[PDB]
PDB file of C-alpha atoms in Angstrom:
ATOM      1  CA  UNK K   1     -69.357-225.615  17.336  1.00  9.10           C
ATOM      2  CA  UNK K   2     -67.578-228.246  19.417  1.00  6.37           C
ATOM      3  CA  UNK K   3     -69.294-231.266  20.970  1.00  5.07           C
ATOM      4  CA  UNK K   4     -68.336-234.305  23.045  1.00  5.08           C
ATOM      5  CA  UNK K   5     -70.289-237.551  23.380  1.00  4.43           C
ATOM      6  CA  UNK K   6     -70.050-239.279  26.759  1.00  2.00           C
ATOM      7  CA  UNK K   7     -71.238-242.805  27.542  1.00  2.00           C
ATOM      8  CA  UNK K   8     -71.559-244.915  30.690  1.00  2.00           C
ATOM      9  CA  UNK K   9     -70.793-248.212  28.955  1.00  2.00           C
ATOM     10  CA  UNK K  10     -67.905-249.150  26.665  1.00  2.00           C
ATOM     11  CA  UNK K  11     -70.394-250.721  24.256  1.00  2.00           C
ATOM     12  CA  UNK K  12     -72.030-247.359  23.558  1.00  2.00           C
ATOM     13  CA  UNK K  13     -68.595-245.777  23.156  1.00  2.00           C
ATOM     14  CA  UNK K  14     -67.590-248.111  20.325  1.00  2.00           C
ATOM     15  CA  UNK K  15     -70.924-247.439  18.620  1.00  2.21           C
ATOM     16  CA  UNK K  16     -70.541-243.676  19.022  1.00  2.24           C
ATOM     17  CA  UNK K  17     -66.902-243.497  17.935  1.00  2.00           C
ATOM     18  CA  UNK K  18     -67.833-245.667  14.951  1.00  2.00           C
ATOM     19  CA  UNK K  19     -70.706-243.380  13.956  1.00  3.33           C
ATOM     20  CA  UNK K  20     -68.636-240.205  14.280  1.00  8.25           C
ATOM     21  CA  UNK K  21     -64.894-240.969  14.527  1.00 10.13           C
ATOM     22  CA  UNK K  22     -64.004-237.450  13.391  1.00 12.11           C
ATOM     23  CA  UNK K  23     -65.833-236.042  16.415  1.00 12.75           C
ATOM     24  CA  UNK K  24     -64.658-236.136  20.031  1.00 11.97           C
ATOM     25  CA  UNK K  25     -65.627-239.254  21.982  1.00 11.10           C
ATOM     26  CA  UNK K  26     -64.901-239.923  25.654  1.00  7.31           C
ATOM     27  CA  UNK K  27     -66.426-242.725  27.728  1.00  7.17           C
ATOM     28  CA  UNK K  28     -66.726-242.179  31.480  1.00  8.75           C
ATOM     29  CA  UNK K  29     -67.655-244.655  34.212  1.00  9.43           C
ATOM     30  CA  UNK K  30     -66.444-243.038  37.433  1.00 14.59           C
ATOM     31  CA  UNK K  31     -66.196-239.502  38.811  1.00 13.39           C
ATOM     32  CA  UNK K  32     -62.416-239.551  38.392  1.00 13.91           C
ATOM     33  CA  UNK K  33     -62.716-240.686  34.775  1.00 10.94           C
ATOM     34  CA  UNK K  34     -65.044-237.872  33.714  1.00 10.43           C
ATOM     35  CA  UNK K  35     -62.877-235.359  35.572  1.00 10.00           C
ATOM     36  CA  UNK K  36     -59.794-236.213  33.516  1.00 11.28           C
ATOM     37  CA  UNK K  37     -61.977-236.107  30.403  1.00  9.94           C
ATOM     38  CA  UNK K  38     -63.493-232.681  31.057  1.00  5.23           C
ATOM     39  CA  UNK K  39     -60.011-231.219  31.509  1.00  5.46           C
ATOM     40  CA  UNK K  40     -58.761-232.963  28.369  1.00  6.67           C
ATOM     41  CA  UNK K  41     -61.548-231.557  26.195  1.00  4.18           C
ATOM     42  CA  UNK K  42     -61.472-228.220  28.015  1.00  4.06           C
ATOM     43  CA  UNK K  43     -57.897-227.713  26.815  1.00  2.82           C
ATOM     44  CA  UNK K  44     -58.688-228.930  23.298  1.00  2.00           C
ATOM     45  CA  UNK K  45     -61.573-226.486  23.000  1.00  4.10           C
ATOM     46  CA  UNK K  46     -64.963-228.035  23.718  1.00  2.32           C
ATOM     47  CA  UNK K  47     -68.324-226.291  23.369  1.00  4.05           C
ATOM     48  CA  UNK K  48     -70.990-228.912  24.070  1.00  6.54           C
ATOM     49  CA  UNK K  49     -71.314-232.338  25.691  1.00  8.34           C
ATOM     50  CA  UNK K  50     -73.877-235.094  25.153  1.00 10.09           C
ATOM     51  CA  UNK K  51     -73.906-237.770  27.856  1.00  8.12           C
ATOM     52  CA  UNK K  52     -75.774-241.056  27.447  1.00  4.88           C
ATOM     53  CA  UNK K  53     -77.066-243.194  30.298  1.00  5.97           C
ATOM     54  CA  UNK K  54     -75.362-240.760  32.662  1.00  7.41           C
ATOM     55  CA  UNK K  55     -77.014-239.250  35.736  1.00  7.23           C
ATOM     56  CA  UNK K  56     -78.154-235.631  35.466  1.00  4.92           C
ATOM     57  CA  UNK K  57     -76.915-234.811  38.968  1.00  5.75           C
ATOM     58  CA  UNK K  58     -73.429-235.874  37.877  1.00  5.67           C
ATOM     59  CA  UNK K  59     -73.265-233.988  34.579  1.00  9.98           C
ATOM     60  CA  UNK K  60     -75.054-231.027  36.158  1.00  9.44           C
ATOM     61  CA  UNK K  61     -72.343-230.564  38.785  1.00 10.00           C
ATOM     62  CA  UNK K  62     -69.369-230.882  36.435  1.00  9.32           C
ATOM     63  CA  UNK K  63     -71.179-228.820  33.801  1.00 11.72           C
ATOM     64  CA  UNK K  64     -71.491-226.000  36.335  1.00  8.75           C
ATOM     65  CA  UNK K  65     -67.757-226.037  37.057  1.00  8.18           C
ATOM     66  CA  UNK K  66     -67.140-226.541  33.338  1.00  5.99           C
ATOM     67  CA  UNK K  67     -68.992-223.455  32.106  1.00  8.04           C
ATOM     68  CA  UNK K  68     -70.514-225.221  29.099  1.00  7.38           C
ATOM     69  CA  UNK K  69     -73.802-226.561  27.739  1.00 10.01           C
ATOM     70  CA  UNK K  70     -74.638-230.089  28.892  1.00  6.99           C
ATOM     71  CA  UNK K  71     -77.092-232.362  27.086  1.00 12.19           C
ATOM     72  CA  UNK K  72     -78.548-235.741  28.049  1.00 10.80           C
ATOM     73  CA  UNK K  73     -79.235-238.564  25.593  1.00  8.46           C
ATOM     74  CA  UNK K  74     -82.516-240.486  25.668  1.00  7.56           C
ATOM     75  CA  UNK K  75     -82.293-242.442  22.414  1.00  5.75           C
ATOM     76  CA  UNK K  76     -80.093-243.058  19.373  1.00  2.43           C
ATOM     77  CA  UNK K  77     -82.139-240.444  17.518  1.00  2.88           C
ATOM     78  CA  UNK K  78     -81.150-237.950  20.214  1.00  4.50           C
ATOM     79  CA  UNK K  79     -77.437-238.649  19.773  1.00  2.00           C
ATOM     80  CA  UNK K  80     -77.397-238.064  16.016  1.00  2.00           C
ATOM     81  CA  UNK K  81     -79.817-235.157  16.418  1.00  2.00           C
ATOM     82  CA  UNK K  82     -77.852-233.317  19.104  1.00  3.63           C
ATOM     83  CA  UNK K  83     -74.561-233.753  17.247  1.00  6.85           C
ATOM     84  CA  UNK K  84     -76.209-232.977  13.909  1.00  5.95           C
ATOM     85  CA  UNK K  85     -77.071-229.390  14.835  1.00  6.60           C
ATOM     86  CA  UNK K  86     -74.026-229.277  17.113  1.00  4.09           C
ATOM     87  CA  UNK K  87     -74.961-225.899  18.590  1.00  6.08           C
ATOM     88  CA  UNK K  88     -78.623-224.927  18.758  1.00  5.10           C
ATOM     89  CA  UNK K  89     -80.664-224.375  21.912  1.00  2.00           C
ATOM     90  CA  UNK K  90     -84.049-222.715  22.312  1.00  2.00           C
ATOM     91  CA  UNK K  91     -85.842-222.285  25.631  1.00  2.28           C
ATOM     92  CA  UNK K  92     -86.960-224.292  28.662  1.00  2.00           C
ATOM     93  CA  UNK K  93     -89.649-226.970  28.383  1.00  2.00           C
ATOM     94  CA  UNK K  94     -92.301-224.649  29.818  1.00  2.00           C
ATOM     95  CA  UNK K  95     -93.269-221.861  27.416  1.00  2.00           C
ATOM     96  CA  UNK K  96     -95.053-218.539  27.920  1.00  2.00           C
ATOM     97  CA  UNK K  97     -96.843-216.493  25.259  1.00  2.00           C
ATOM     98  CA  UNK K  98     -99.892-214.408  26.169  1.00  2.00           C
TER      99      UNK K  98
END
């Protein structure tokens, strides 16, 4: 499973790339930046994408036109966790079992 970590600040990028240099890391700040990134990874063969400090409305849009699974980061534990499993999604927040 492929995954890409996206950050809003360069600081987070250095920390991410340092934690997992073997993995794909791309820092985006503007709409044009992310665009060039999505295409870059799209050609390489991406599967997932974990953005940190990024707006959901932004990732949501691109994700739709990207045809991939988008994930948002809330804490450092979420970054290592998401990447750890790489590919593993269950169901929506709201459950249903009667």
